[PDB]
Amino acid sequence: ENLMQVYQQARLSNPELRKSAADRDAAFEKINEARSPLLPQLGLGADYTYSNGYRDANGINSNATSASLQLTQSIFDMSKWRALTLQEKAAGIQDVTYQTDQQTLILNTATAYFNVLNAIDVLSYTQAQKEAIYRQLDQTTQRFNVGLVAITDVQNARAQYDTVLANELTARNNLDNAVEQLRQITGNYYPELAALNVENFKTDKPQPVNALLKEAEKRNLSLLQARLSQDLAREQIRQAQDGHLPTLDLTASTGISDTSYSGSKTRGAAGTQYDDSNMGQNKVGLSFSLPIYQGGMVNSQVKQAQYNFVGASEQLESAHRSVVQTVRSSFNNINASISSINAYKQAVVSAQSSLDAMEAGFSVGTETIVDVLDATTTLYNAKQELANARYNYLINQLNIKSALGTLNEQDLLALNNALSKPVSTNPE
Amino acid sequence: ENLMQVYQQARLSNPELRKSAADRDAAFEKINEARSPLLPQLGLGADYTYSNGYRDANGINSNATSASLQLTQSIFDMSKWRALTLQEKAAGIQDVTYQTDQQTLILNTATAYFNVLNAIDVLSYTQAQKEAIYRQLDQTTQRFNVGLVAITDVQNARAQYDTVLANELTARNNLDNAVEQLRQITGNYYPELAALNVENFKTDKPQPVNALLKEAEKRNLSLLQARLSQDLAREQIRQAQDGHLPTLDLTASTGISDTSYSGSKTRGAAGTQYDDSNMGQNKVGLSFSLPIYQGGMVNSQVKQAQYNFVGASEQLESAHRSVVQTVRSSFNNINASISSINAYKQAVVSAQSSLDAMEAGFSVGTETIVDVLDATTTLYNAKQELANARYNYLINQLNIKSALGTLNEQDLLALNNALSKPVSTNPE
Amino acid sequence: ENLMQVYQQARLSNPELRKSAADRDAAFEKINEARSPLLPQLGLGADYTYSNGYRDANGINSNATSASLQLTQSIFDMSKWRALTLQEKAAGIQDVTYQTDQQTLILNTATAYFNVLNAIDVLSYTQAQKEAIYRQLDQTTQRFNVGLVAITDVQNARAQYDTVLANELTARNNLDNAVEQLRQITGNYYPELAALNVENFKTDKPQPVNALLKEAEKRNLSLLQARLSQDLAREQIRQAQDGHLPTLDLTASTGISDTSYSGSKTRGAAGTQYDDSNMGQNKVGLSFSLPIYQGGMVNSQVKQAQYNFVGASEQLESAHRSVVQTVRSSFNNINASISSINAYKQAVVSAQSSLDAMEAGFSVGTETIVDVLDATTTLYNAKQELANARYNYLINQLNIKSALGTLNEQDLLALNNALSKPVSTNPE
Ligand SMILES: [Cl-]
Ligand SMILES: [Cl-]
Ligand SMILES: [Cl-]
Ligand SMILES: [Cl-]
């Protein structure tokens, strides 16, 4: 299948990304829980007591019950207001981390895809080698029979061939376990997928460095979080400072209050005391609180938040310096990836002409078999190296985009025009 | 000492494991703390105080002393029962982590043990390669003495010999460190270890791909945990919801209360209601509390607990996906391992192109030394590959059992039979 | 600039070390927050309530305001004293974290610097391996047209040359990436860096491994913090069992409160009138509290604390077990590094003499270019390694200082002498 079909059937079925969503959804959900202390609170209370102790002055037994609707409404708290802003501040950061975890999923699917893709290429070339030197191995054990080739050359040929049996083995395994990186970031066994078309290939020169660096130090997801995180630490210098500010609360209630009286000293009593008191209530009130001095606590908390700000500040410096080098580094990687293909292709023909001339030398008996087996292995390496440079450019293209922050569907779309022929993924 | 003796010494002492033990013993003990708020709560407290006539209170100033036994008891506080369940679940997860860690100690002890043995093989084979090159250098010198060998041949030999001395250096340094590795797991230095006896090396395949996948879905330790934690998230919804329910509480007091007055004792129009009041009471009242509208707070948390559940459900698929691509991965690996032993077992056989052919013809003047050297590396470049591949097998059996979660003390009892020959860790 | 200078530029500008500082500075500042509950706690408050009649209250309303000046002063409370002790010990463990971070920068700088120096050497030599084989190619094709026909083996020399272009390619890149690397840590691009002076280069044996070990055990910073943390655990045991102790308090407050009544009850008396009650009071009081039983909470708290202390002890074992294995590695690593310098040192003079003889031979026609290229390749390999070995040495020399925890500017000044000849960080 096409890349944008492996990823397509993977982005909606990705167990990490969705958890990142459920994290953001909960982070946004409590935007209400942080608001709730700024709304009227209402409860229903009901008590029943049984008093029974006795006098050295008072005494007497009683039975009281009660019920009420209490209400509270904050008027000027600020810290309750502050906790609301912080929860808004903190959900934005959690929304960027999701936008970041969206970013990552692209790469990992692409990377795991090409992991499998050039895993074939290696096993494919090891199969191409293991047989191209089976031609050399066969004819030589017949050229030996004519007596033209020594009793020693064949022995060396057989041993070099066996150490290609081993390479082929740990090239199958490399293809298998690569499929087992894709069956995770995707959750699918793909029996075939689109190989990159060899001649349908054009290496476009990466856009200039300083232009990429400016664009990134604005739309990059990593310093955005670090900036929003300096915002969070900043509003916390304010949160600590609220511990000086006064507070104003409103109460309103409607209660009932019954009483009864038991035993002796209650029966046959004088006046109002045994009297069963059955009354209720309607209250409305205002409470005001202002801290004068407390151990220098709220002081300490401010400096603490200030230092925490210096921190989150330097943490941005780390985040900026990181991006500073992610663009340069991958820009060097996409440049070098150009020169690499333009060098390894040159070495494919150079190793090629050297090979066929050795087979011409193996003919007419002017050259050895151990000499042509050097010619073959140095050819197939040049090819293998050529394959890698192609994939490293593709992967470093995404990186240079992803460092900017601008990695999306469209970047992954323009890469379907490059690939074509569907290749097998089974090491049989 | 052998693998079981070395392992069992590690079990006793290993600080990583015993920490992981305390972390579980503490967590289990926390059940008692989490249960405490359900049992009776018995406090006590005295309370002296002194009043003053600041305005109309003039000439009325009190001093009252009071003591009291205070008892509270929960009769249906739902959130408290939930706290106990949550903590039992908390300790359930914590016992499973401790189990994983037991698995980890085993895999580590063996991993580190089969480093020392491999280090010994790279050393052996290097100084075997070293001592062999010295033979062919020796007889080349004395052939050059009698003018049969061009100086380049000797210059070449001595060059290759000098690399091998440099290799014989890094080979000893590795073994030196690999000992120090074994000691920071185990706690002891080992003057000798039982090496792999190659004569009776069994290489029987594994159980089919599916038999493991099944077995590693009932028995596997890291998945069992992702289950237990999705459970914990469920039980946490239940917890959140309990913010709606009413709470009922039994209370009981009994305490003295002695006041006295003195100031403008008595003037007029009142009565001596300022007599030395010596109170005693004996309360046993139970009370009820139910919340109506709490600012939409309790629902946010119900929604959040649900979003957090979806997330805990997400990372259960993630854990499952891990499990597949660890059994499948570890299966492929044990295949390539056995498959590799064969390939490298013949590669060593065919590498006796060095044996005859090269060594033979060199001694009778036929083959050039440079070529005889290239043979006498290829053989040893296969000797190491073989022994290395064998120890890769022995820790791919163990790797599967880790995925199956059945990895235990028994599986070492197997591998201790494979060993036999006591070889020293600090040769020469 | 030089190693010493690059550090001074990074010391003041590094975002990581400066963030560490902020974390330490906050920690120390917290000792004030922790101390604050032991000091007086002054607070002003004000109320207003309107009560309205219901049943037996029907026809009685009230308007009451009050204003007080409250103060709380803890007399005896071990927990509040324990909180302060703990915060200080917290700040201490933070301080050792900071000291550790100071070191990591030093070690990290050196690594990045000698990586730029190593990428120079790797490139500088690749070009000298490229230029040697270009002469090789030129001063061969001159003879090829005329004399000894090289149709089969001048194409091999051309393929040889093409791979050393793809090699110099990668080399060019590993210099850029290694500089951006140095930048991140230092916040500087460097055109010039002081390189190692081979003439000036000596090697000094390390102090005996036992002297080192003893020295580490007494001032290694990881072990120091490990001991501090185990102390924290112990003190947290005491903190738990402070639950058993009583809490003697003091509260002083001077207040003002007045109630004015309204409704169907304005004929009667409380004293001279049953209406106005403007009054104030001055209060001072002690407040004894003592828990007697509470679900066995405190008992389990101490059991947890104790178990948790076992983990701190086990962690202290892990630390020591580590410092042992680190110190002994750092020792092994340095001795092997000297022993390697010596080996590769001879490996060049050997490789030179081999090539010297090969150049001379081929110069007459007694040797082939295939052999003169192989000989040139192995000379630059040895020169590569030798360069690499000395740079490694210096690192292992700092590593050992880092293991016994004494690494500082002094050590970075030491190496400054061995550097001198300034090299460009990109000639192209
Ligand atoms: Cl304050
Ligand atoms: Cl609600
Ligand atoms: Cl208790
Ligand atoms: Cl110790």
Question: What is the 3 state secondary structure string of chain A?
Answer: CCHHHHCHHHHCCCHHHHHHHHHHHHHHHCCCCCCHHHCCEEEEEEEEEEECCCCCCCCCEEEEEEEEEEEEEEEECCHHHHHHHHHHHHHHHHHHHHHHHHHHHHHHHHHHHHHHHHHHHHHHHHHHHHHHHHHHHHHHHHHCCCCCCCCCHHHHHHHHHHHHHHHHHHHHHHHHHHHHHHHHHCCCCCCEEEEECCCCCCCCCCCCHHHHHHHHHHHCHHHHHHHHHHHHHHHHHHHHHCCCCCEEEEEEEEEEEECCEECCCCCCCCCCCCCCCEEECEEEEEEEEEEEEECCHHHHHHHHHHHHHHHHHHHHHHHHHHHHHHHHHHHHHHHHHHHHHHHHHHHHHHHHHHHHHHHHHHHHHCCCCHHHHHHHHHHHHHHHHHHHHHHHHHHHHHHHHHHHCCCCHHHHHCCCCCEEEEEECCCC
Return the structure tokens found at C231: 């102390």
Residue A418, CB-side half-sphere exposure with 13 Å CA sphere: 16
Q: Which of A422, A181, A211, A171 is nearest to A327 (CA)?
A: A211
CB atoms < 10 A from the CB of B165, how many?
19
Q: With beta carbons less than 8 A apart as the criterion, state whether B216 and B403 touch.
A: yes
- A41 contacts chain B (CB < 8 A): yes
| 3-class DSSP assignment, residue B261 | strand
Alpha-carbon distances, residue A415 vs A110, A199, A338, A409 (angstroms) = 10, 14, 17, 10
Angle between helices A370-404 and C155-186 (to 10 degrees): 30
| C55 residue type, one letter | R
Q: What's the rounded Cα separation, in Å, for the pair C314 and C308?
A: 10
Q: C63 — phi, psi (to 5°)?
A: -125, 105
CA neighbor of C358 nearest in space, from C344, C369, C346: C369
Q: Give CA separation, A396 vs A391, C129, C327, in Å.
A: 8, 29, 40
d(CA C409, CA A349): 54
The candidate with the shortest Cα–Cα distance to B29, out of C241, C300, C302, C236, is: C300
In whole angstroms, what is the distance from residue C422 CA to residue C428 CA?
Answer: 16
- Which H/E stretch holds residue B253? strand B247-258
Tokens 């359900």 sit at which residue? B38
Q: Would the CB atoms of B155 and C277 count as touching at under 8 Å? A: no
Backbone angles phi, psi at B74, to 5 degrees: -80, 125
Interface check B172 vs C, CB under 8 A = yes
Buried-state track B170-197, b at ≥16 Cβ within 10 A, e below 16: ebbbbbbbbbbbbbbbbbeebeebbbbe
- Among the listed residues C7, C194, C373, C128, the one whose alpha carbon sits nearest the alpha carbon of residue A378: C373
Breaks in chain A after residues, C-to-N cutoff 2.5 Å:
none
What backbone phi and psi angles, to 5 degrees, belong to B287? -125, 160
Amino acid at B192: E
Q: Which amino acid is at C256?
A: I
How far apart, in whole angstroms, are the C-alpha atoms of residue B389 and residue B381? 12
Three-class HEC string of chain C: CCHHHHHHHHHHHCHHHHHHHHHHHHHHHHHHHHHHHHCCEEEEEEEEEEEECCCCCCCCEEEEEEEEEEEEEEEECHHHHHHHHHHHHHHHHHHHHHHHHHHHHHHHHHHHHHHHHHHHHHHHHHHHHHHHHHHHHHHHHHHHHHCCCCCCCCHHHHHHHHHHHHHHHHHHHHHHHHHHHHHHHHCCCCCEEEEECCCCCCCCCCCCHHHHHHHHHHHCHHHHHHHHHHHHHHHHHHHHHHHHCCCEEEEEEEEEEEEEEECCCCCCCCCCCCCCCCEEEEEEEEECCEEEEECCHHHHHHHHHHHHHHHHHHHHHHHHHHHHHHHHHHHHHHHHHHHHHHHHHHHHHHHHHHHHHHHHHHHHCCCCHHHHHHHHHHHHHHHHHHHHHHHHHHHHHHHHHHHCCCCCHHHHHHHHCCEEEEEECCCC
Does an H or E element contain B32, and which?
helix B15-35
Contact C125, A320 (CB under 8 A): no
In terms of residues, how long is chain B? Answer: 428
Q: Record the tokens describing residue C345, joined without a space.
A: 């040192």
Phi, then psi, of C196 in degrees rounded to 5: -70, 140
Q: ∠ at Cα C184 (C181, C189), nearest 5°?
A: 80
Neighbours of C201 (CB within 10 A): 12
Q: Which of A12, A49, A253, A428 to mutate to test the interface with B (most CBs of B within 10 A)?
A: A49
Helix (H, G, I), strand (E, B) or coil at B136: helix
CA distance A179 to A193: 11
> Would you say the C-alpha torsion B373, B378, B384, B387 has a positive or negative sign?
negative
Instruction: Give the distance, in angstroms, between the CA of residue B284 and the centroid of all CA atoms in the same chain.
Output: 52
The secondary structure of residue B44, as a DSSP letter, is E
CA B373 – CA B153 distance, rounded (Å): 11
Q: Which chains does chain A touch, 3 or more C-beta pairs < 8 A?
A: B, C
Torsion angle defined by CA atoms of residues C369, C371, C376 and C379, in that order, rounded to the nearest 10 degrees: -170
The token pair at B9 is: 């010494």
Determine the angle formed by the axes of helices B3-13 and B78-145, rounding to 10 degrees: 140
Backbone angles phi, psi at B42, to 5 degrees: -110, 100
Q: Which SS3 state, helix, strand or coil, does residue B150 take? A: coil
Q: Is B130 helix (H, G, I), strand (E, B) or coil?
A: helix
Determine contact, residues C24/C94, Cβ cutoff 8 Å: yes
- Axis-axis angle for helices C297-364, C221-241 (nearest 10): 170
Residues of B in contact with A155 (CB under 8 A): 350, 353, 356-358
CA of C42 to the centre of ligand 1 (A): 10
Per-residue DSSP letter, B221: H
Is the Cβ–Cβ distance between C5 and A251 less than 8 Å? no
Task: Output the CA torsion C234→C235→C238→C239 (10° steps).
Answer: -130
Q: Which of C77, C174, C165 is nearest to C122 (CA)?
A: C174
CA distances from C169 to A119, B57, C355 (A): 24, 97, 25
Q: Which residue of A has its CA nearest to B251?
A: A49
Please report, in angstroms and rounded to a whole number, the separation of the first and last CA atoms in chain B.
19
- What does the block give as tokens for C159? 């393929």
Parallel, antiparallel or unpaired: strands B60-66 and A419-424: unpaired
Amino acid sitting at position A393: Y
Pairing of strands B278-281, B247-258: antiparallel
Q: Tell me whether strands B247-258 and B286-293 are parallel, antiparallel or unpaired.
A: antiparallel
- Helix (H) or strand (E) holding B126, with range, is helix B78-145
- CB spacing of A163 vs B297 below 8 angstroms: no
CB neighbours of residue C260 within 10 Å = 13
Secondary structure of residue B420 in the 3-state scheme: strand
Q: Which two tokens stand for residue B359?
A: 């060594």
Angle between helices A153-185 and A370-404 (to 10 degrees): 20
For residue C181, which phi and psi values (nearest 5 degrees)?
Answer: -60, -50
Kind plus residue range of the DSSP H or E element containing B49: strand B47-50
Residue B261: strand pairing partners:
B62
**CA-based angle C33:C35:C39, to the nearest 5?**
110
The strand pairing partners of A196, in sequence order, are A419
Cβ-based neighbours of A354, under 8 Å, separated by 6 or more: A375, A378, A379, C155, C156, C158, C159
Q: What is the C33 CA–ligand 1 centroid distance (Å)?
A: 9
Residue in B with minimal Cα distance to C350: B159
> Residue B38 is encoded by which pair of tokens?
């359900």
Cα C106 to Cα B163: distance, rounded to the nearest angstrom? 34
Distance between CA A268 and CA C290 in Å, rounded?
42
Which of the 8 DSSP states describes residue B63? E
Please answer whether residues A168 and A105 qualify as being in contact, where contact means their C-beta atoms are separated by less than 8 angstroms.
Answer: no
CA dihedral (C345, C346, C348, C349) in degrees, to 10, reads 130
| Element containing residue B225 per DSSP (H, E) | helix B221-241
Pairing assessment for the beta strands B60-66 and B261-263 based on DSSP bridges: antiparallel
Q: What is the resolution of this structure in A?
A: 3.2
Mutate to test the interface with A, among B273, B293, B327, B372 (most CBs of A within 10 A): B293
AA identity, residue C103? Q
Burial class (CB in 10 A: 0-12, 13-18, 19+), C408: exposed
Decide: helix, strand or coil at residue B6. Answer: helix
Q: Which of residues 290-349 of A touch C (CB under 8 A)?
A: 290-297, 299-301, 303-304, 307-308, 310-311, 314-315, 317-318, 321-322, 324-325, 328-329, 332-333, 335-336, 339-340, 343-344, 346-347
Domain ranges of chain A: 1-428
**Chain A neighbours among B 239-268 (CB < 8 Å)?**
254
CA proximity to B212, closest of B337, B99, B338, B325: B325
Sign of CA dihedral C7, C10, C15, C21: positive
The tokens 């302060």 sit on which residue?
Answer: C84
Question: Taken in order C325, C331, C335, C341, is the CA torsion positive or negative?
Answer: positive
C280 touches C256 (CB < 8 A): yes
Find out whether C344 and C385 touch, Cβ atoms under 8 Å: yes
Tell me if residue B250 falls in helix, strand or coil.
strand
Count of Cβ atoms closer than 10 Å to residue B218 Cβ: 10
Residue of A nearest to B275 (CA): A57
Taking the C-alpha atoms of residue C398 and residue C235, their distance in angstroms, rounded to an integer, is: 36
- What token pair was written down for A115? 């992991």
Task: Find the ligand nearest to A40 CA.
Answer: 2
d(CA B223, CA B318): 9
CA distance linking residue B176 with residue C118, whole number of Å: 26
Closest CA to A120 of A178, A199, A68, A36: A178
Going by C-beta distance under 8 Å and a sequence separation of 6 or more, which residues neighbour residue C139? none
CB B42 within 8 A of CB B71: yes
> Cα(A389)–Cα(A385) distance, rounded to whole angstroms?
7
Give yes or no for a contact between A71 and A253, defined as CB atoms under 8 angstroms apart.
yes
Beta carbons of A356 and A329 less than 8 angstroms apart = no
Q: Look at the block and give the residue holding tokens 């020959």.
A: B421
Instruction: Give whole-number Cα distances, B418 to B3, B120, B386, in Å.
Output: 10, 17, 16
- Neighbouring residues of A186: CB distance < 8 A, sequence distance ≥ 6: A6, A7, A9, A10, A13, A109, A112
Sequence-distant (≥ 6) Cβ neighbours of residue A198 within 8 angstroms: none
For chain A, the residue count is 428
Regarding the domain with residue range A1-428, which homologous superfamily does it belong to in the CATH classification? Outer membrane efflux proteins (OEP) (1.20.1600.10)
Q: Which two tokens stand for residue B264?
A: 């403008």
Lookup: tokens for C203: 């090697």
Burial (CB count <10 Å: 0-12, 13-18, 19+), residue B8: middle
- Candidate from B297, B325, B353 with C-beta closest to A36: B297
Query: Which two three-digit tokens encode residue B404?
Result: 């199956």
User: Are residues B286 and B249 in contact, defined by beta-carbon separation less than 8 angstroms?
Assistant: yes
- Torsion sign across C-alpha atoms C364, C370, C373, C377: negative
Nearest to A284 by CA among C64, B289, C257, B293: C64
Residue corresponding to tokens 């061969």: C140
Other beta carbons within 10 angstroms of residue A365's beta carbon come to 10
* CA distance linking residue B310 with residue B332, whole number of Å: 33
8 Å CB contact between C7 and C198: no
Chain breaks in chain C (C to N over 2.5 A) after: none
User: How far is the C-alpha of B307 from the C-alpha of C315, rounded, in Å?
Assistant: 36
User: How distant, in Å, are the alpha carbons of B246, C253, C277 from that of B56?
Assistant: 44, 17, 8
The method recorded for this entry reads X-ray
How far apart CA A387 and CA C237 sit, in angstroms, is: 63
Say which amino acid occupies C127. Answer: Q
CA distances from C69 to A248, B337, C72 (A): 17, 81, 11
With beta carbons under 8 A apart, name residues in chain A contacting B322.
Answer: 184
